[PDB]
């Protein structure tokens, strides 16, 4: 009979097989495919889901704060943040034997704990947290915020509180409020916290809710701000002998732009960060008054889009009708948001390792490596999702009649040229990068290392020289002492920036050579190939020569059968599917390069990387084989240490990856026949045929098989690299 689950799909509820549960779980968030769904109901469900997501995020943050305040060593880590390892949380496992108990008992705790690698200790220490009471109060506050967000999500679904469809389409009002309030006012408030709490707490002065109304952030007290003498806030900054957390060497300035890093914490100045947030707050608030909402002044995005067509007709109709195809399509907005968020996540990773913002973050090698790898993998997944949603937009929301002659239609008009050129770039990069690598490998194998091709990256070195690095000797722009660009910043920020960039002990514009050139080309190959697969799948989503009516089958369908030569993996979903492997490979190459260069930097031997990164054998032996010795020795027949959990996780990831290869290689048919034999065996077995199944056992579908195999592949990939990176970086240092 018809089952209750899933309530959103009547066709799935009538399915008498096990496929009903799987499809009900995988199509729960596809509100557009639900039964009796309207546009207004769609937007309302997304609103409630957004509130629930915020509730989960805030609860997770409160949980991290609570566990650090309860089972951590934050009160002891602030005293000696160079020789004390941060504690994530305690370990309570009845499966642990005695050696595992004393092995994980470290960091000054009274029992087995986990050493945190997220870097929340440095972040909380920099923003002003000093005691466990502060973390406890922050945890309770975030839990209350999470409960409020959850209640808001439940409340916006009840009658008299459901927003209308017209409210969700007010793009001008939403953009104005997000730029001025969500971005500008939030940044201004963060500036207020840095000026009022973080900066005085870094100078040994406690400023909490009990005394912030009686403690002045500056000795002049708002007089220079109102009189326009803003330069008075940059007078007397922290000297080079300032000790973080104490008043020794501290200054009085609150808004500076010294640049560079703090001599002790090796991080950005707090006054510089406060000034940064103040400037971007003013800029975002000003930008929040651009669109017309209810007072006559402002813009209409439709007018700006319609008045942006070239006169010669190079772009056809230009952007006519682009306002309606974006405002009425949620997949277009989701794709744009994911593309920007993925790029910003990558930007965060690069800027965070190169310019550490939190105190004593550069010394924590495990934290730096884990944070960079985490943000780069998150960025790669988000980028793949952006392109997948672009393909979904082409299939479900693109209207050729409304987008007639504009840039959107012209993209599909010459999609063959785009795919062909992406293919050519990827082919050239792959052929040459692989050829140079194999050539260097043959030269190193034959005992002639002077015969390998080592192309110097003169363009990137030229840019590094433009930033102030005098190692290469170009002597121009910031590298030349007689340039206008150099002389115009010598009194504001160039001294600190130049001192930091010319220091070879940090990660600020590291020295590069032929190995960096080759790996950068490998990165370019990965980016271009992943882009080729994603772009080709989005452009061919509506159809191709093999499947002229692909848009009539949806975004995800198994195939079109073995006819016409065979149509396996013809849908756009399959294109995203194949692109996830390339994304994992690209992020693997970038994280491998980052980890090896930083490992050789921290070990004090950059020549090892410079001489072994030019051939793949050096990558396999000097980086993968050499750095995994301590990892695989976490547990051996002679005993175990605290690093055994990473060894177990290493083997765990290998097992999950290999398990994924099963769903990836073997296909449905074999499993369906095997399941039929199992059905017969259960039906003909006494004492067991009395227990019957409620859902008919069937093999996983083709699409489900691909998703399951990719999920196992990605999980094994991530867990294996995370275990190796954390174990190698923590054991070495």
């Amino acid at each position: 009979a018809t089952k209750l689950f899933p309530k959103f799909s009547q066709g799935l509820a009538q399915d008498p097989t096990t496929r009903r549960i799987w499809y009900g779980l995988a199509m729960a968030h596809d509100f557009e495919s639900h039964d009796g769904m309207t546009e207004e109901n769609l937007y309302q469900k997304i609103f409630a889901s957004h509130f629930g997501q915020l509730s989960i995020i805030f609860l997770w943050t409160s949980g991290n704060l609570f566990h650090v305040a309860w089972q951590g060593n934050f009160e002891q880590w602030v005293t000696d943040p160079v020789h004390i390892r941060p504690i994530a949380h305690a370990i309570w496992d009845p499966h642990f034997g005695q050696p595992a108990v004393e092995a994980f008992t470290r960091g000054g705790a009274s029992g087995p704990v986990n050493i945190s690698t997220s870097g929340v200790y440095q972040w909380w220490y920099t923003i002003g947290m000093r005691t466990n009471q502060d973390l406890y109060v922050g945890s309770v506050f975030l839990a209350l915020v999470s409960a409020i967000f959850l209640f808001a999500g439940w409340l916006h679904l009840q009658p008299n509180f459901q927003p209308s469809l017209s409210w969700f389409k007010d793009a001008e009002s939403r953009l104005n409020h997000h730029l001025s309030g969500l971005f500008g006012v939030s940044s201004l408030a963060w500036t207020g916290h840095l000026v009022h709490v973080a900066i005085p707490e870094s100078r040994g002065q406690h400023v909490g809710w009990d005394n912030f109304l009686s403690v002045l952030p500056h000795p002049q007290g708002l007089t220079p701000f109102f009189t326009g003498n803003w330069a008075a806030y940059a007078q007397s900054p922290d000297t080079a002998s300032h000790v973080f957390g104490t008043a020794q060497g501290s200054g009085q300035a609150i808004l500076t732009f010294l640049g560079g890093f703090h001599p002790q914490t090796q991080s950005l100045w707090l006054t510089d960060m406060a000034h940064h947030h103040l400037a971007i707050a003013v800029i975002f608030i000003v930008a929040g008054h651009m669109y017309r909402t209810n007072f006559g002044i402002g813009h209409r995005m439709q007018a700006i889009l319609e008045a942006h067509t070239p006169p010669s007709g190079s772009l056809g109709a230009g952007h006519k009708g682009l306002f309606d195809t974006v405002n009425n399509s949620l997949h277009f907005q989701l794709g744009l948001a994911l593309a920007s968020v993925g790029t910003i996540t990558s930007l965060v990773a690069q800027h965070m390792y190169s310019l550490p913002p939190y105190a004593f973050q550069a010394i924590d090698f495990t934290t730096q490596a884990a944070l960079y790898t985490h943000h780069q993998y998150i960025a790669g997944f988000i980028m793949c999702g952006a392109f997948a949603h672009g393909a979904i937009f082409f299939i479900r929301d693109y209207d050729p009649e409304q987008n007639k002659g504009n840039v959107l239609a012209r993209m599909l008009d010459h999609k063959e040229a785009l795919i062909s050129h992406l293919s050519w770039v990827s082919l050239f990069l792959g052929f040459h990068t692989l050829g140079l690598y194999v050539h260097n490998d043959v030269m190193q194998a034959f005992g002639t290392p002077e015969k390998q091709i080592l192309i110097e990256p003169v363009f990137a070195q030229w840019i590094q020289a433009a930033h102030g690095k005098a190692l290469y000797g170009f002597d121009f722009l910031l590298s030349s002492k007689t340039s206008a660009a150099f002389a115009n910043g010598q009194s504001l920020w160039l001294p600190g920036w130049l001192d930091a960039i010319n220091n070879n002990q940090n990660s600020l514009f590291l020295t590069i050579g032929p190995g960096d050139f080759l790996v950068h080309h490998a990165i370019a190959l990965g980016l271009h190939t992943t882009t080729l697969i994603l772009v080709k799948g989005a452009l061919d989503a509506r159809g191709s020569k093999l499947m002229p009516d692909k848009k009539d089958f949806g975004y995800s369908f198994p195939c079109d059968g073995p006819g016409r030569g065979g149509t396996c993996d013809i849908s756009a979903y399959d294109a995203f599917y194949l692109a996830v492997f390339w994304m994992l490979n690209t992020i693997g190459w970038v994280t491998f390069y980052w980890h090896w260069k930083h490992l050789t930097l921290w070990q004090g031997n950059v020549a090892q990387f410079d001489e072994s990164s030019t051939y793949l054998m050096g990558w396999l032996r000097d980086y993968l084989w050499l750095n995994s010795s301590q990892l695989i020795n976490g547990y051996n027949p002679f005993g175990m240490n605290s690093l055994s959990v990473w060894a177990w996780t290493f083997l765990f990831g290998h097992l999950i990856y290999a398990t994924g290869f099963m769903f990836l290689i073997s296909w449905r048919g074999y499993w369906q026949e095997l399941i039929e034999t199992l059905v017969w065996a259960h039906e003909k077995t006494p004492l067991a045929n009395l227990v019957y199944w409620k859902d008919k056992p069937v093999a996983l579908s083709i699409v489900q098989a691909r998703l399951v195999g990719l999920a196992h592949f990605s999980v094994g990939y991530i867990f294996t690299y995370a275990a190796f990176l954390i174990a190698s970086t923590s054991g070495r240092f």
């Binding site: 018809t2 089952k3 209750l4 509820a13 609570f66 309570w92 406890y136």
Partner: protein, 37 residues
């Protein structure tokens, strides 16, 4: 203070690991196989 007792992990870890998942799995299993009227 918000500090939990010393015996809090010995009670919450077995709860969240065996009691709560068993109840959740049983309730979810009954809900999935429930037949519509």
């Amino acid at each position: 203070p918000f500090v939990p007792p010393s015996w809090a992990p010995s009670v919450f870890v077995p709860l969240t690991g065996l009691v709560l998942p068993a109840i959740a799995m049983a309730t979810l299993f009954v809900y999935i196989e429930k037949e519509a009227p």
